[PDB]
Amino acid sequence: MIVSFMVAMDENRVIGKDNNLPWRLPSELQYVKKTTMGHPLIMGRKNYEAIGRPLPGRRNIIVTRNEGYHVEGCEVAHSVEEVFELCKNEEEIFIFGGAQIYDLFLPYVDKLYITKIHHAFEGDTFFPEMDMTNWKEVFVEKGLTDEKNPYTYYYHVYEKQQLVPR
Ligand SMILES: CCC[C@H]1c2ccccc2C=NN1C(=O)/C=C/c1cc(Cc2cnc(N)nc2N)cc(OC)c1OC
Ligand SMILES: [Ca+2]
């Protein structure tokens, strides 16, 4: 299965403030919806609670250590192992964040969908550093900037650099 990171972050890798997005870009979220259609969304509990509702049309899988945690319309996993078990047959899954959730799936990640917002916000949580020399850009696109989407931002997609033998 393809393990994909789905992330939107600013110039300093901010991905959150107080728990919410420091920015409001409806068009970005529509890109998320289009891209993840028919694939599982994997997210930490805090991240899911910040969004408020199950995102329709996808397996919403919430990752928490809490064995008692349950929520309507969502599945719950308590470890990476359980997530991979649950997505046994999936073609591609999207790690939807929680800085800590990205860290858990780092050893397995195959594809990066990264929205880079060209602005510096106030934030308290960050997309962990990554050595991008292992990664190759396969797609880029300038996001729609307008009245409802004030900032400038870009969709980037990365796959693994293949490496030429000695
Ligand atoms: C309204 C239409 C889209 C709707 C939706 C409906 C169905 C299926 C998927 C989605 C996508 N999200 N949708 C939302 O309202 C909320 C998205 C959201 C997300 C993220 C994470 C995220 C944000 N962005 C990126 N690129 N990576 C990401 N990992 C964080 C949020 O608050 C912290 C969110 O809520 C503001
Ligand atoms: Ca892998």
SS (H, E, C) 128-163: CCCCHHHEEEEEEEECCCECCECCCEEEEEEEECCC
Beta-carbon contacts of residue 56 (< 8 Å; ≥ 6 apart) = none
Task: Match 């998320």 to its residue by tokens.
Answer: 32
- Exposure string for 81-102, b = 16+ CB within 10 A, e = fewer: eebbebbeeeeebbbbbbbebb
Fold of 1-166: Dihydrofolate Reductase, subunit A (3.40.430)
Q: Residue 6 has which token pair?
A: 């789905």
Closest ligand 1 atom to residue 24 Cα is 36
- Cα(108) to centroid(ligand 2), Å: 4
Q: Residue 132 has which token pair?
A: 């991008």
State yes or no: 59 annotated in a binding site: no
Minimal CA–CA distance to 119: which of 21, 18, 49?
21
Closest ligand 1 atom to residue 94 Cα is 29
State yes or no: 152 annotated in a binding site: no
Rounded to 5 degrees, what angle do the CA atoms 58, 75, 31 make? 25
Question: What is the C-alpha to C-alpha distance for residues 156 and 68, in angstroms, rounded to an integer?
Answer: 37
Cβ atoms of residues 120 and 22 within 8 Å: no
- For ligand 1, say whether the CB of 30 is within 6 Å of any of its atoms: yes
Q: Residue 105 has which token pair?
A: 């799936």
Alpha helices for the chain (secondary structure H)? 26-35, 45-51, 80-86, 99-105
Task: Match 């409806």 to its residue by tokens.
Answer: 26
Candidate of 51, 74, 96 to mutate for ligand 1, largest count of ligand atoms within 8 Å of Cβ: 51
Among the bound ligands, name the one nearest to the CA of residue 15. Answer: 1
Dihedrals phi, psi of 22, to nearest 5 degrees: -65, -15
- Cα(87) to centroid(ligand 2), Å: 13
Question: What is the C-alpha to C-alpha distance for residues 31 and 73, in angstroms, rounded to an integer?
Answer: 23
Tell me the resolution in Å. 2.3
Structure method: X-ray
